[PDB]
Amino acid sequence: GTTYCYSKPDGRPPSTVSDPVTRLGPTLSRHYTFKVGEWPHSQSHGHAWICPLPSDKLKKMGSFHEVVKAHHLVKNGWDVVVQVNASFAHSGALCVAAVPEYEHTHEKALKWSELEEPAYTYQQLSVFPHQLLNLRTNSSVHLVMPYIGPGPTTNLTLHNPWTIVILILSELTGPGQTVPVTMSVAPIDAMVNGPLPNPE
Amino acid sequence: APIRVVSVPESDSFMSSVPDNSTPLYPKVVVPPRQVPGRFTNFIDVAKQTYSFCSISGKPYFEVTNTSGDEPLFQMDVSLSAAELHGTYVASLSSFFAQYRGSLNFYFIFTGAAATKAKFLVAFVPPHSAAPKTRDEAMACIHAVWDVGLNSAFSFNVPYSSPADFMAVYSAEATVVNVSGWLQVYALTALTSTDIAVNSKGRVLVAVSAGPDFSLRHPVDLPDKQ
Amino acid sequence: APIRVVSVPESDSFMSSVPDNSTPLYPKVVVPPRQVPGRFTNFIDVAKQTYSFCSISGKPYFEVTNTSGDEPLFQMDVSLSAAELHGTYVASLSSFFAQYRGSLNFYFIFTGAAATKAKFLVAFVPPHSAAPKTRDEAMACIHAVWDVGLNSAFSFNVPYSSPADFMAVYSAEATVVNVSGWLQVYALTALTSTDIAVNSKGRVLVAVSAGPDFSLRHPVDLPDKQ
Amino acid sequence: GNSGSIVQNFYMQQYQNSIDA
Amino acid sequence: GNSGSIVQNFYMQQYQNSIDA
Amino acid sequence: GNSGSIVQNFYMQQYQNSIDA
Amino acid sequence: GNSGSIVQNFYMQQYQNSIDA
Amino acid sequence: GNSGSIVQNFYMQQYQNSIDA
Amino acid sequence: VTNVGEDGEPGETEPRHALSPVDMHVHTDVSFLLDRFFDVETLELSNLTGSPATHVLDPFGSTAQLAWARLLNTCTYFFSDLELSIQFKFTTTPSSVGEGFVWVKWFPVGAPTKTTDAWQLEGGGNSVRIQQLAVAGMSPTVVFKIAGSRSQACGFSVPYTSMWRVVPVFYNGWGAPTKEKATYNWLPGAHFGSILLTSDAHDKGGCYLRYRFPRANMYCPRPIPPAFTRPADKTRHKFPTNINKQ
Amino acid sequence: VTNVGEDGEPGETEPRHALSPVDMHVHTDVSFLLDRFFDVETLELSNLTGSPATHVLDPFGSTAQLAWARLLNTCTYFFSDLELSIQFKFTTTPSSVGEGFVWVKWFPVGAPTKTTDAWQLEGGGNSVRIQQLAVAGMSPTVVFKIAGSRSQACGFSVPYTSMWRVVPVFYNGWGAPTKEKATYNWLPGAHFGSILLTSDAHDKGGCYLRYRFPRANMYCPRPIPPAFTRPADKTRHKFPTNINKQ
Ligand SMILES: CC(=O)N[C@H]1[C@H]([C@H](O)[C@H](O)CO)O[C@@](O[C@H]2[C@@H](O)[C@@H](CO)O[C@@H](O[C@H]3[C@H](O)[C@@H](O)[C@@H](O)O[C@@H]3CO)[C@@H]2O)(C(=O)O)C[C@@H]1O
Ligand SMILES: CC(=O)N[C@H]1[C@H]([C@H](O)[C@H](O)CO)O[C@@](O[C@H]2[C@@H](O)[C@@H](CO)O[C@@H](O[C@H]3[C@H](O)[C@@H](O)[C@@H](O)O[C@@H]3CO)[C@@H]2O)(C(=O)O)C[C@@H]1O
């Protein structure tokens, strides 16, 4: 099933640049697929994998990557699909969400990592565009977020608006092994500004 | 020609909630437009169209084991200032007010592995007596049956029952508009599993959405933390 | 019959920008009419329909010699409180405000004698990195080519690129709405001349008009000179 | 939202507050 | 330009200010 | 008789004074 | 009942008091 | 002659001043 | 499964003849909850002379248990105009200030700042110097007296000045190229602008900030902080009220 | 040559999808920038007796770093009406003046001038004499009290009086046949007229001039003075603001 982050993505071009605008064909902003982590039997609830998009992992988008390198700003959504792998003997659930200006991160900003939320948060995480991954029901959370932020577009090198939380609700109960989480980000409606110079 | 005026007794008093506004000193400011998604209008909307996760001994779920019977599994004084609400959205939103009103929807999501199955009697017990202590005691009241393995999740509506046109967002030593009853989940059967050495227990998340007839009133300021 | 009135708390306060006017004490003054030409209405008009002359080491021009290469010839932090703007109209007009907005047009007028010719790469470099230092470095960015001896004058538009709906008329220690980039003219070739003993260098004036989308806002009072 | 007098428009809609596009 | 109240015309256009021909 | 303002009816004809039959 | 001025509605019927259904 | 406000007629033409025949 | 009641039946819950309406939710209207006066802050003045500091209207920090604290924390992005009341309280014997002329000036999102005495009023020796920007002009000045002043306060409305179409009450980014600490959830001009109170009091008094935010616009709901300790198991949270066993 | 972008090409620049509008320029509207109160000047009073001096409303001289200073320097010819606020500050112990009756009179462009005490109020010996022109009549008089006066100020509007259809803020000529120095950029009645403040204070106080110029009309743009020192090469001019690295 497909769940939308506040609204379908707009291919509108930035209300704040008289500067020339390169739109990114899918074939440039292609698709990317990596493993988040291995949800283990010990990690008590309140845990989570922070995936602030896209940075840290931006070095690895090797094409989309490339154009955002030599360009000052970008506006883009995200088709993102988190995929836990587990059998029918495992129990537990997570809740993975897209969060607007998420922050806590102990300033390990724009670096994916792992944390334990304060609780009032995991309790109310669901107050954001999120989906449930319930080990006796499904094995996939699917979301699509639109460009968002104070500016009508930003610098992905300084700001990451979207950030996926992958929260542990009910601990992993079942067979001794771990359950590998995974995620496919692929940029939607990409658009660049100001080419920067040559790396010399 | 000067108008004839009498200076109403309060004249130079302040009052922090005047239905009227102050004098402008920086006119002609046109502001930049905002597309920015998800502008909410009223707080009851997110509270209705949004599930919060309950609070029991610190976790947002309750357990079923391969051993339970009539010992009530989940119990809560129906009051906003109840325990199992403490963590949630709805509850915390209401702190911003004096009176609440309406039904609340509970979402239990059984999350034990598919090799697993179990059943519960979720029941609502009206605020009179001295609280039931066994399934066979609650059964005579409003309840339904949940066979996890028909739906792995279920919704249950805690109704609004009171001479009280409105209820108390700030409960206390038991009054007539202080409580509306008790929510209780009981274990109808126990945990049957393909292999009890792997799956011995199950975790049912329990979430709370705001009721369609739910409403809040009389905004209030915060007292001493406690 | 007297009206019932309450004296709003600020009542006898002054406030220097009241959207309203004071009481007249000398009415019936009819004034003599004025033909007098060039009455301007809004300050942005003269700023748009008018070129100011830049500021580099004290003079309003930059030099090309019969020896230059990639050494950048003209460079400026795109900020109103930038150096090469200091002398100009636009820049000084903006001091009267807090936020600017839009593109600016640059007019380079090559003024070396007709026996003379040369070329430049005027380029605009976006506010990220740490500023380029050679033509072959800037070239990868927004720029055009000016062959003096096709047009003896050329215009170049420094665009508005920012998440910032508005920008800072009063810049400072580098912020995200403090700078919009860098203007740089480089020497594409050098000074070719009929006789290098007479014409060894050339002076390109550089003027600044306000951008068509250019606007200013939030009038401000003057701080300590500095 | 909460502005309820008649004199609330003693000043203009233009002068008083801010204006969107 | 900057006169924005309603009472701004409490006094006449003739009395208040000056008048061109 | 002697009541001459406009605001003389700031209050109602009913509230202000007395009323004959 | 006893509200008799003109300015009695200086404030709205909605803001001033309470409202039945 | 020099009376220029709007409230200049706050009082009546009859009460305020004098009246010719 | 089965739904509408009475039969022991599995998925079958009982009936609910849901309620009527009253109040039409209206109190929970974000625009209404915000259009009133809040006692946000408390600050002291500056002497008419010295080289003083401007103050910043940033009601986005929070931490102080105040209702308006949270609520602004309830949303990701915010926009509303501003409205003030400044009251000036006395901290000594009220008979010390015979005049008590107070200069206030409001500075819009992104205004210049260095101020030193620069205006000189003179007359019969002694002679006062007010601040270089306390003066009246471009940014609104407000001068009021506190000498029997039946309400030692002043007040006014001020527009959304920022250059940001909206204000991020949270920012997963930095506002500067130099990714320093402090520059975290920052992004400049993410506030209402600033003010300067200055007077022959300064000592003899504190102030009383109060904001009213008309035209409130809140984008993206966020988790709403608890505000009270977690009560014990299967119990309520008893509190003192207008009700209660007397 | 070539124009619209991408081809290395000579005269060919790149594209510019120019901006939208917001604010409609409106702040830079000369009529709006000028219709507010400015703290222009500061002067002392005159004793109710003596043979005092009138003061001249000439905001065309400048030199004082004040925004309204420049701006009036921005144009060759000017016309606007006037508006005042006079505040009177205290320069001693405020308990010295029990009464504090202040006489003010406004004089239109080109009025007669010699004044000596000439009005005598008497009653129970002592008896006060006010000024020959402080009196009420033809030119507007304004008398106000400063004795607990919650705002020690007074204020009003005054019309463009000059006999000049417009005022030359600059004059390449003389205003007299006798081409003397002083008579240079002069031309008489190139201002708003004058005022006389007089009172049993005079000592004990200074004043606070404030002008508001409605209906501003500016003819012929002129060079706009810099107002800040020239910064160093290839650098910016860093300043303190409502933004800045904290
Ligand atoms: C913004 C500004 O220019 N501030 C300066 C102030 C103001 O100009 C002044 O307060 C206007 O009221 O003035 C400062 O300089 C004054 C100071 O040096 C005094 C001390 O002698 O003299 C002033 O000029 C006198 C002049 O000497 C007399 O001949 C006569 O013309 O009167 C004037 C003033 O009434 C200086 O302007 C100051 O001291 O604060 C400098 C501030 O930067
Ligand atoms: C404009 C003018 O004429 N100024 C003169 C003032 C005013 O007329 C006077 O203040 C009106 O209130 O008066 C001056 O002359 C007065 C002065 O000589 C005193 C001193 O004795 O006497 C005044 O006349 C007395 C008169 O003596 C009594 O018989 C009685 O009639 O009372 C009057 C006044 O109440 C003179 O008019 C003055 O002294 O200032 C001359 C000014 O030029």
DSSP B22-65: PPBSS--EEPPP---S-EE-BHHHHHHS--EE--BTTBSEEEEE
The region that residue J142 occupies, defined by phi over 0 for left and psi between -120 and 50 for alpha, beta otherwise, is: beta
Tokens 């959504």 sit on residue: A77
Residue J4 Cβ inside 6 Å of ligand 2? The answer reads no
Q: Which atom of ligand 1 is nearest to the CA of J43?
A: 35
Query: In angstroms, what is the span from residue C43 Cα to ligand 2's centroid?
Result: 58
Q: Å from J69 to nearest chain C CA?
A: 10
- The continuous run of DSSP H or E covering C141 comes out as none
Residue J142 CA to ligand 1 centre (angstroms): 28
Closest CA to J75 of J191, J217, J175: J217
CA of A173 to the centre of ligand 1 (A): 82
CA atoms of B41 and B38, how far apart (whole Å): 9
Contacts of C27 in chain E (CB under 8 A): 12, 14-16
In the DSSP assignment, the letter for residue B222 is -
Ligand nearest J120 Cα, by number? Answer: 2
Ligand 2 contact, J176 CB (< 6 A): no
- Minimum distance, in Å, between the CA of residue J218 and any CA atom of chain I: 18
Q: How much distance in Å is there from the Cα of I120 to the middle of ligand 1?
A: 7
CA distances from H3 to C26, C69, I53 (A): 12, 79, 50
Q: How far is the CA of J118 from the centre of ligand 2 (A)?
A: 9
- Three-state SS at C190: coil
Nearest Cα neighbor of B29 from C178, J23, D21, H15 is J23
| Residue C6 at interface with chain F, using a CB cutoff of 8 Å | no
Burial of C194 (0-12, 13-18, 19+ CB in 10 A): exposed
Q: Determine the Cα angle at A86 with ends A84 and A90, to 5°.
A: 120
| Nearest-CA residue for atom 17 of ligand 2 | J120
Helix ranges, chain A (H): 64-69, 120-125
Judge whether I86 and I208 are in contact, CB under 8 Å. yes
Contacts of J205 in chain I (CB under 8 A): 123-124
I137, I163, I188 ranked by CB distance to C221: nearest: I137
Phi, psi (5° rounding) for residue I178?
-90, 95
Ligand 2 and J120: CB distance under 6 A: yes
Closest in I13, I159, I231 to B83, CB measured: I231
Please list every residue in chain F whose beta carbon sits closer than 8 Å to the beta carbon of residue C3. Answer: 7, 10
CB A186 within 8 A of CB A77: no
Please name the residues in contact with F17: beta carbons below 8 A apart, sequence gap of 6 or more: none
Query: J86 C-alpha vs ligand 2 centroid, how far in Å?
Result: 32
The residue of chain B nearest to residue H15, with distances taken between CA atoms, is B1
Amino acid symbol at C51? Y
Distance of CA B215 to the CA centre of its chain: 12
| Bridge partners for J158 per DSSP | J82
Strand order, beta sheet including B99-101: B167-168, B99-101, B215-217
Distance separating alpha carbons of residues C202 and I58, to the nearest angstrom: 53
Sign of CA dihedral I230, I232, I235, I240: negative
The residue whose C-alpha atom lies closest to atom 8 belonging to ligand 1 is J64
Give the C-alpha separation, I198 to I45, whole Å.
5
Question: C: neighbours with 3+ CB pairs under 8 Å?
Answer: A, B, D, E, F, G, H, I, J
Q: Which ligand is nearest to the CA of J62?
A: 1
Structural domain of B170 = 1-226
Q: Encode chain J in three state secondary structure.
A: CCCECCCCCCCCECCCCCCCCCCCCHHHEHHHHHCCCEECCCCECCCCCCCCCCEECCCCCCCCCCCCCCCCCCEEEEECCEEEEECCEECCCHHHCCCCEEEEEEECCCCCCCCCEEEEECCCCCCEEEECCCCCCCCCEEEEECCCCCCCCEEEEECCCCCCCCEECCCCCCCCCCCCCCCCCCCCCCCCCEEEEEECCCCCEECCEEEECCCCEEEEECCCCCCCCCCCCCCECCCCECCCCC
Mutation choice for ligand 1 from I48, I120, I130, CB with most ligand atoms inside 8 A: I120
Ligand 2 pocket member J118 (CB < 6 A): yes
Q: What is the resolution of this structure in A?
A: 4.0
Asked if B4's CB is within 8 angstroms of C5's CB, the reply is no
Question: Which residue's alpha carbon is nearest to atom 12 within ligand 1?
Answer: I120
Domain A1-195 sits in CATH at 2.60.120.20
Residues of E (1-21) whose Cβ lies below 8 Å from D: 4-7
Return the DSSP state at C82: B
Chain position carrying tokens 């836990």 = A84
Q: Closest Cα partner for C127 from J21, J231, A158?
A: A158
CB-based contact, C28 to chain G, within 8 Å: no
Per the omega criterion (within 30 degrees of 0), is the bond before A54 cis?
yes
Dist. CA A37–CA A83, nearest whole Å: 10
Strands (E) in chain I, as ranges, are 38-39, 55-56, 75-79, 82-86, 89-90, 101-107, 117-121, 128-131, 141-145, 154-158, 167-168, 194-199, 205-206, 209-212, 217-221
Hey, how many other C-beta atoms are within 10 angstroms of the C-beta on J95?
Answer: 9
CATH number of the domain to which B176 belongs: 2.60.120.20
Q: Is D13 on the interface with B (CB under 8 A)?
A: no
Distance of alpha carbon J135 from the chain centroid:
25
Ligand 2 pocket test target in J49, J116, J120 with most atoms within 8 Å of CB: J120
Give me the DSSP letters along A39-67: E-SS--TTEEEEEESSTTGGGGSTTHHHH
**What is the rounded CA–CA span in Å between residue C200 and residue C191?**
7
Q: Which ligand is nearest to the CA of J117?
A: 2
Grouping H, G, I as helix, E, B as strand and the rest as coil, residue C109 is strand
Q: Count of alpha carbons within 13 Å of A170, Cβ hemisphere only? A: 30
Subunits next to D (3 or more Cβ pairs <8 Å) are B, C, E, G, I
Rounded Cα distance between B180 and C218, Å, is: 56
The coordinates were experimentally obtained by X-ray
Q: Residue C42: how many CB atoms within 10 A of its CB?
A: 18
I1-246 CATH, one of 3.40.50.300, 2.60.120.20, 3.40.718.10, 3.40.640.10:
2.60.120.20
**Which residue on chain B is closest to J27 by alpha carbon?**
B28
Helix, strand or coil for residue H14? helix
Q: Which two tokens stand for residue B200?
A: 């011995």
- The rounded Cα B40 to chain-centroid distance in angstroms is 20
Pairing of the two strands C167-168 and C61-65: unpaired
The tokens describing I11, both together, are 């998925």
**Nearest-CA neighbor of C168 among I176, J127, J194?**
I176
B19 touches chain C (CB under 8 A): no
Q: For residue F6, which residues of chain H lie inside 8 Å, CB to CB?
A: 9-12
Considering only the beta carbons, identify the residue of I10, I108, I240 that sits closest to B147: I10
Question: From the CB of J121, is ligand 2 less than 6 Å away?
Answer: no
Q: How many domains does chain C divide into?
A: 1
Sign of CA dihedral A102, A105, A109, A112: negative
- For ligand 2, what atom is nearest to the CA of residue J118? 4
Residues in D touching G10 (Cβ below 8 Å): 5-7
Token couple for B20: 């009227």
Q: What residues in B contact G15, CB-CB < 8 Å? A: 19
Neighbours of B141 (CB within 10 A): 16
- Determine how many CB atoms are found less than 10 A away from the CB of residue A129: 20
- Phi, psi (deg, nearest 5) at residue C49: -80, 40
B180 touches chain A (CB under 8 A): no
Domain ranges of chain J: 1-246
Q: Is J90 left (phi over 0), alpha (psi -120 to 50) or beta?
A: beta
Nearest residue in chain I measured CA to CA from C220: I138
Q: Which residues of chain A neighbour C103 with C-beta distances below 8 Å?
A: 18
Task: Report the pocket of ligand 1 as residue ranges, CB < 6 Å.
Answer: I 118-120; J 42, 64-66
On chain C, the residues whose CB falls within 8 A of the CB of J161 are: 29
User: B38 to chain C, minimum CA–CA distance in Å?
Assistant: 20
- For residues C187 and C145, the answer to whether their CB atoms sit within 8 Å is no
Q: If you ran DSSP here, which 8-state letter would residue C172 be given?
A: -
- Let me know: does B40 contact I221? Beta carbons within 8 Å: yes
DSSP letter, residue B9? T
Nearest chain B residue to C2, by CA:
B5
**Other Cβ atoms within 10 Å of D5 Cβ, number:** 15
Write the CA distances from I10 to B203, I3, I159, J228, integer angstroms.
20, 9, 59, 82
Whole-number Å distance between alpha carbons of J5 and J221: 36
The residue type found at J203 is: D
Neighbours of I3 (CB within 10 A): 11
The Cα J104–Cα C47 span in angstroms is 42
Task: Give how far B48 is from chain G: nearest CA, Å.
Answer: 23
Half-sphere exposure for A158 (CA within 13 Å, toward CB): 26
For residues A179 and A47, give the distance between their C-alpha atoms in angstroms, rounded to a whole number. 14
Residue J121's Cβ-count burial label (10 Å; 0-12, 13-18, 19+) is: exposed
Task: In whole angstroms, give the CA distance from residue D5 to residue J236.
Answer: 50
Residues 3-22, chain J: which have Cβ within 8 Å of A? 5, 14-20
Residues 113-142 of A with CB under 8 A from J: none
Q: Most A CBs within 10 Å: which of J16, J17, J20, as the mutation test of the A interface? A: J17
The answer to whether A and G touch (≥3 CB pairs < 8 Å) is no
